[PDB]
């Protein structure tokens, strides 16, 4: 009668096995004799509770059982835990929360997981998310870090709506255990909420990488690819739409492969197949793979009526699955899109009528089931209110019932404008559409209905209000109004000033936001030629002559089936403009050919295709035809200016001149005809005829704007005459008459660079000034201003930033493709190098020279024509290559170059001295005598190209350094005549001065035969009478000097030349040395002490080492 | 009323080109009637007006372009010269031998002017402001600045404190010599300006612009006291007497024309120079006018109390 | 000094 | 020239030294080096060529085409279009949000995720000819939609009526 | 609404010339932020903005004329520039001693730009060819073609397989470097480009042109997002943000503004740089904007994001 014995027995039979479990006799038997003889000790009704509920099933028994051992062990969190269980599992939910609280009651801090846990998870399957989430931080809180309870605390707290702890939560359970994949998805879903698809699309991507099956990852990827799509069709972006709705579609297939019962992948694929609507038929095509089209067959295409049915199908499947009025809208809205996809191409009539039931059938299936919902009501009205079908007083109810609904309805109040307003109903469809204005302030359509019915009451402000509503939303409505608009105020002429043409096109920049309004329109539309025919008029506007061409040719291939009276043969008419314009002479010449030429327009642009690709005789002729045809005289005086040229072109200067003359004659001359036989004259040595024109235009034009082309025009008459100095008075007098107008700077920079370049300084000060007054005018002043200081050498205050070196590289850096820059660099760095050897410190910039010659090739090739100039540039450029290959000392690569230009043409002189002058630098470089048959070869070539003072100058130099003082004295008189004869004045200096210092050192040499000191006397006579030269006057010091030696006259002279200022350094320091050497003679200390003061003042060294060197005898 | 006018000397071929600017000197206090001429040139010859005709006295030059305006002091005997060349070169006139040069291009200086007391001789520039100098003591130690185009005219007070300055568009602008703050700009006219003057005991600013019109403005104010218009092209050169009773004004029409400001009316016209006329000028007494036009002519008339 | 009218006789007229 | 050799002392002589010029620029500016040489003349062969004689310029500026004219201008051609507008496109149409969740399961004690089942929210998968017909099936709420209809719009004294 | 902008720093002169060209690199994973300025000389001087300033580390040289682009790359420490002295040496970055030195005219190459990678270094020639280099293994190894003018400026995209090319009279053309193929050669404006970037993510290419507009269009197709024009004077240089909301342009209008391309407005612009400005770029984060101008200035700016 021990119960303790009799329980340890009861557990040696249940211990022993399931075979003494299952005898009945055994352990039943036993703990109820233990339970009747012991009723406190309640893990003996515990375990008769095992028995029972395992081997039994009395579950309600069983229930009562462990309730009563729970009572008498609160402790024995088993017994209590399976009481729970099973009064769960017997929908007995009073007791178990009875027990739960009791528990939790009763656990002050913690030590009632299993309680706590059971709470949550009852109040997560019902709506009790609040209570959910305290049971779940006191589970969290009990001591267990599991992620099990992490991630029902985050589920619910997405549940409810945060969603920063909720991530946080997620993050914790895939930190501690990372082998689960849901907390990562619902991140991902999180991130996919508040917008930021891309960055979901990435998770969901990794996520489907570990695992390959997840449904889940599979819809959201659908869903973010979907919800991209649509973003991309706010704008007019169609194929990165349709890209993102096959990509879509795959996906949905992909997770409808594993689980085909779900009625929301279904609606999902119906969503994605019906949302490519209205969206540029033919450009949709699309990749639907396996199970969809029937029997599994790889991947098949589709287009747009195959896409909607499939998504009809969808829809049907998603709908059978699951009955739901949305899904039935749904259905109805995509058979209400079908029907207007098959209206739209007009590929039949009277056969959609089936579509368009079953639509309003679906359509009142769903607004019957739930009759509380706006949508339901406004999707009726407005299938109801189809031109199709056209049941206004259906759609007016179906309006008044979902404004009803729900009082801000911005939707079906501009529905309702709509409707009244296209039924001549301009003040309550104006009262409809401020009401919508009212309650939605951000509204496109109606701000679209409020400009139409200002366009239909002729206000001021419409071209505003389209303005408005085209940056609002880029609708299409808006800007078809726009675009018409501004083309209309484009055309007419006479608003230039009314302060409305002004302001609308000007201040606002119309032009550009209507070409890209339009263009947007044509990607949308793409089957409307005025819509076209007005972008190919913008795009001429903007000069963008290719896409006016393009728009123009697609305009042409819309309109061939037409009525084509007036619509075909412009956009004919246009394209040929166009294309004729930019080049393709061929090509406008056939769609010149395929119209009748019976209009003014057509026959002139015939004309001018005509004479662009030649053919000038047939140019005459259709000319001749539009003068007999013209009207409108002005357009006939500048069809006798054309005639006059296409003449002049063909030669016969005679009868251009009696065409000009006629134009003249008519009772008002025009400026153009004018201008035009001025040129003439001009292209003529006549001179007379020009002058006469040029008085006619002076007298009687004032309206012309363009000052630079009438001083063109005057400078070139005063050219042509030979005086070469009044073209620099005359653009003075025009730059003094008007201050502005940088060009003027530029053309006086210009031709002060050109003729009588001895105003140097002034014509850098015109350059700089040109290229301060504006941008756009510098490169071309930059260039002229560069020349400018080339021509002046080193006249200047040796500053730095400020030599041509600087401005040529930066006239290069602005326009890299004129062959003049890069001849000026070449030529400023061989300046540079004469200017570093003259100060004796380094050369710099020593071999660019073949790269700068490649550039002034290429450059040279790309221009229209320019002949003369072309050919004297390329001959300049490679001259100048030569010589600077030739002076650093790469005498291969020279004789290389001169080669090739010999082997590419036959001879000619240049190129032959060129060559001469490359083999003879080795030679005569070291003293050696040459035979006389070199010499007659050289003196040969010297002749072959005559007229050039440096071939000379070059001769003699050789002739005196191998040695004949008389053939360099002949030389030197030849080329000053010759420069003397042909205008030039420095070549004159130079030779003056070169001849006097030849003549000077052969009498230094102590030679007899004293004509060399006359020579040296008469050559510095002559150049000093030409000019103040430093040099001649230190030639003279020098020679006078020589003879007396000792004559004080010497001195004074001397004294003069170096103390007197303004003189550089050079001829200074040898003054000095001779003028300390004349004193020395004349043994003057005073003098000397003076001389050497002087020379410490200014910075020598050489005056001072002669005087210490003679002062220590 | 009209009284009696006549010419009474003409000069056949003073310079070989356009002449630019003309400057009347009585300067040194015994009588001196020094006139100096500048005309697209380099030349900037000295003229002297003995008892009846002109003598040709220095033919000074040194410039590489035409010589845009010519100024000759009151005080000292000295005159000043700028060109397109950029640069103000100042001669002495007595020997007349470049006793200065200072650099300043077209964006730096356009047009001449001395100061009352011969001090400063200020410029105007392209960016708008009026770049003052020092002679013989420095140069650019300061510059007024505004904010507009290119300025073409600037004038002084008889008495100082003041600095009117014209510009192209019109804007004209009034400065202060003792503090140097912009007082007031006025809109003017809409087309270049090119000439201003101030009177005697000064009180009144007579404006000529590109239209035609000669605006007479009342300075400390912005009251403009009249409009006149009796010319039929640009007015290029306006002068205004000793005595505040007339002033002498030149156009682009071959005419040169005398008002008077108490009754704003043309006394009187004359019909000479063919060519368009750029210079109009008093002497120290009202009693005799010169005048150089485009062509290379020396007109003198005489003009009595 | 030839003017524009004077040309267009004499050209007319030879 | 006579072509008589005339020979010249080989040294110089130390006590004076050489004369050995350069020019610079076309406008007369020379100097000199002490080292005896070649010439030396900066651009031995003149400036280069810059821009084109305005003969020429001018020439090319109106004989070159007739294409400067303005009668092949932008302008003179009088273009005109037509307008046509479009009230209907102005209707607007939305779709029914999405009706269920799919919200995942658990198990009851010891929250453990059994799989995914469809919740409501607040054979031969090839979808082979699944339209509807036989419509009008249930009763959702009997409305009639073709005897009495609105016509007073609300905030509106009267409305537009149409047979 | 509109941020707080500051520019917290202001270089007295940098270089003794105009500075043409910018280049601002994070290339190490610490704090490095490399500036690295070309300015029409030798001087290819390297500068560190440490915790508030820029201090120079480098003055490198060994250039015969101006230098007109640099480049810098991400990954390694490599930095090169190309000039008109026909020559593109590329240098070390870390001792700044000409690592290895290219020969090639204005008529082989003219802009330069990285790889993402760092490795092949294209360029554009005269004749329209992009001839492309390879830093470490050779010399001119091939050349995508394209039948057009001369090619100003090169661009390659953060994600690689895209290279767009601005020309001059607009034409635009891009290739793919997977194959190098011409996809579509866009018409663009009439002017010269001069300017290109992409964006990160590269699905919009921003042009900058000399006309004044600036074009967004769209990559993968033909459609432009739309035309921007708020700049008075031509656009020299345009730098995209590390983040796709702003774009920063600096035209010859002494201006450097900043717009955003979600909304297509400036949301502020800076009024510094009183002369032209040739270049501004972002650093590693969207906070500060470094820029250099025709004047010798280096302006850092302070952009919050």
Partial sequence: ?1113 | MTNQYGILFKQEQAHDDAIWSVAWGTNKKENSETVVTGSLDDLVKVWKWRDERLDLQWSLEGHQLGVVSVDISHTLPIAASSSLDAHIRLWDLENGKQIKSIDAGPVDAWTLAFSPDSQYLATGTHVGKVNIFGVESGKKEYSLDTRGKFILSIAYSPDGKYLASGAIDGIINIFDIATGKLLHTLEGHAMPIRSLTFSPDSQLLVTASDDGYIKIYDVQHANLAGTLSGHASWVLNVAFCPDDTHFVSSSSDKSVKVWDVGTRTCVHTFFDHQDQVWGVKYNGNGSKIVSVGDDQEIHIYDCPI | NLSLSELIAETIDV | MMETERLVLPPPDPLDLPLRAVELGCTGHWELLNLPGAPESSLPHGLPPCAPDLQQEAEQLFLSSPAWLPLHGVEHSARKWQRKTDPWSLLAVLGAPVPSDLQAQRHPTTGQILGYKEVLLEGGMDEPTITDLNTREEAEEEIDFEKDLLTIPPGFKKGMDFA
Avoid at chain 1, 211 to 239: F, I, N, Q, R, T
Wanted: proline content about 2%; charged content about 20%; aromatic content about 8%.
């Fill in chain 1, 1 to 1113: 009668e021990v119960a303790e014995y009799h329980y340890q027995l009861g557990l040696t039979y249940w211990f022993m096995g399931e075979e003494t479990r299952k005898d009945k006799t055994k352990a039943l038997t036993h703990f109820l004799k233990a339970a009747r003889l012991d009723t406190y000790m309640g893990k003996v009704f515990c375990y008769l509770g095992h028995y029972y509920r395992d081997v039994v099933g009395d579950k309600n028994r069983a229930r009562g059982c462990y309730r009563k051992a729970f009572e008498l062990d609160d402790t024995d969190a088993e017994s209590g835990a399976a009481a729970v269980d099973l009064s769960v599992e017997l929908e007995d939910m009073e007791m178990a929360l009875a027990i739960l609280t009791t528990v939790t009651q009763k656990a002050s801090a913690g030590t009632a997981k299993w309680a706590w846990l059971r709470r949550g998870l009852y109040y997560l399957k019902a709506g009790q998310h609040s209570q959910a989430v305290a049971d779940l931080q006191a589970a969290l809180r009990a001591d267990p870090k599991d992620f099990n309870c992490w991630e029902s605390l985050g589920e619910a707290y997405l549940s409810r709506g945060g969603y920063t702890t909720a991530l946080k939560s997620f993050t914790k359970a895939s930190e501690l255990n990372p082998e689960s994949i849901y907390s990562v998805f619902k991140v991902a879903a999180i991130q996919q909420i508040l917008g930021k698809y891309k960055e979901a699309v990435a998770q969901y991507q990794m996520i489907i990488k570990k695992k390959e099956d997840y449904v889940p990852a599979l819809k959201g990827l659908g869903e973010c690819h979907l919800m991209m799509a649509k973003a991309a069709l706010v704008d007019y972006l169609d194929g990165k739409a349709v890209d993102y709705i096959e990509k879509a579609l795959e996906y949905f297939t992909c997770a409808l492969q594993h689980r085909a019962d779900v009625s929301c992948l279904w609606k999902l694929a119906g969503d994605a197949c019906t949302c490519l609507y209205a969206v540029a038929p033919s450009k949709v095509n699309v990749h639907v793979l396996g199970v969809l089209l029937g029997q599994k067959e790889g991947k098949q295409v589709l287009k747009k009526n195959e896409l909607l049915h499939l998504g009809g199908r969808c829809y049907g499947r998603a709908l059978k699955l699951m009955s739901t009025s949305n899904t039935w809208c749904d259905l109805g809205i995509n058979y209400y899109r079908q029907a207007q996809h098959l209206a739209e191409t007009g590929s039949n009539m009277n056969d959609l009528k089936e579509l368009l039931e079953k639509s309003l059938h679906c359509l009142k299936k769903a607004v019957r089931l739930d009759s509380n919902n706006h949508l339901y009501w406004n999707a009726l009205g407005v299938v109801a209110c189809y031109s199709g079908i056209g049941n206004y007083a259906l759609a007016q109810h179906c309006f008044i019932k979902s404004i009803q609904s729900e009082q801000i309805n911005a939707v079906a109040w501009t529905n309702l404008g709509v409707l009244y307003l296209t039924n001549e109903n301009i003040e309550q469809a104006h009262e409809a559409f401020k009401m919508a204005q009212s309650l939605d302030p951000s509204y496109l359509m109606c701000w679209i209905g409020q400009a139409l019915i200002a366009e239909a009451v002729g206000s001021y402000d419409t071209m505003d209000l389209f303005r408005h509503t085209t940056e609002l939303n880029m609708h299409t409505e808006g800007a078809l109004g726009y675009a018409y608009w501004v083309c209309t105020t484009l055309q007419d002429k006479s608003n230039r000033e009314t302060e409305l043409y002004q302001y609308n096109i000007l201040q606002m920049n119309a032009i550009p936001a209507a070409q890209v309004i339009l263009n947007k329109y044509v990607e949308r539309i793409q089957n409307y030629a005025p819509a076209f025919t007005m972008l190919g008029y913008l795009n001429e506007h903007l000069q963008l002559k290719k896409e006016a061409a393009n728009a123009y040719q697609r305009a042409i291939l819309l309109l061939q089936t037409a009525e084509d009276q007036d619509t075909y043969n412009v956009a004919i008419r246009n394209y040929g403009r166009l294309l004729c314009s930019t080049g393709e002479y061929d090509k406008a010449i056939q769609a010149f050919k395929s119209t009748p030429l019976e209009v003014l327009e057509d026959i002139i642009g015939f004309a001018l295709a005509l004479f662009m690709k030649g053919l000038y005789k047939e140019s005459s002729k259709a000319y001749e035809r539009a003068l007999s045809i013209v009207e409108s005289e002005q357009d006939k005086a500048h069809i006798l200016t054309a005639l006059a040229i296409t003449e002049y072109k063909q030669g016969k200067t005679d009868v251009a001149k009696t065409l000009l003359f006629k134009c003249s004659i008519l009772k008002e001359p025009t400026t153009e005809s004018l201008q035009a036989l001025c040129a003439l004259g001009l292209a003529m040595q006549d001179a007379t005829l020009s002058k006469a024109a040029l008085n006619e235009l002076l007298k009687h034009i004032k309206h012309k704007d363009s000052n630079y082309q009438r001083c063109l025009l005057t400078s070139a008459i005063y050219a042509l005459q030979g005086r070469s100095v009044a073209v620099q008075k005359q653009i003075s007098k025009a730059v003094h008459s008007n201050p502005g107008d940088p060009a003027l700077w530029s053309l006086l920079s210009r031709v002060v660079a050109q003729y009588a370049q001895r105003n140097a300084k002034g014509g850098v000060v015109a350059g700089n000034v040109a290229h301060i007054l504006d941008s756009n005018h510098g490169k071309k002043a930059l260039l002229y201003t560069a020349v400018n200081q080339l021509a002046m050498g080193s006249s200047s205050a040796e500053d730095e930033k400020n030599t041509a070196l600087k401005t040529i590289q930066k006239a290069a850096l602005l326009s890299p493709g004129d062959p003049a820059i890069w001849a000026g660099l070449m030529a400023a760095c061989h300046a540079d190098d004469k200017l570093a050897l003259v100060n004796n410190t380094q050369p710099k910039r020593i071999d660019l020279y073949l790269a700068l010659l490649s550039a002034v090739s290429a450059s040279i090739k790309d221009e229209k024509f320019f002949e003369n100039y072309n050919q004297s540039l390329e001959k300049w450029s490679l001259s100048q290559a030569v010589t600077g290959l030739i002076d650093t000392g790469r005498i291969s690569e020279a004789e290389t170059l001169c080669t090739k230009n010999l082997k590419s043409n036959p001879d000619q002189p240049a190129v032959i001295l060129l060559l001469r002058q490359v083999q003879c630098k080795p030679l005569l470089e070291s003293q050696k005598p040459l035979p006389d048959a070199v010499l007659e070869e050289l003196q040969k070539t010297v002749m072959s190209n005559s007229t050039s003072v440096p071939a000379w100058q070059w001769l003699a130099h050789v002739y005196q350094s191998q040695g004949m003082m008389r053939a360099a004295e002949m030389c030197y008189r030849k080329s000053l005549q010759l420069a003397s004869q042909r205008g030039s004045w420095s070549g004159k200096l130079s030779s003056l001065l070169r001849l006097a210092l030849l003549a000077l050192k052969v009498c230094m040499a102590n030679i007899s035969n004293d004509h060399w000191p006359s020579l040296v006397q008469e050559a510095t006579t002559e150049a000093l009478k030409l000019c103040f030269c430093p040099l001649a006057v230190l030639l003279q010091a020098l020679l006078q000097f020589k003879r007396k030696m000792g004559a004080r006259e010497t001195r004074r002279l001397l004294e003069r030349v170096v103390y007197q200022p303004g003189y550089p350094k050079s001829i200074a320091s040898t003054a000095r040395w001779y003028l300390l050497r004349h004193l020395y003679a004349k043994d003057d200390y005073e003098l000397i002490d003076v001389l050497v003061n002087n020379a410490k003042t200014h910075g020598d060294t050489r005056a001072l080492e002669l005087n210490q060197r003679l002062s220590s005898q």
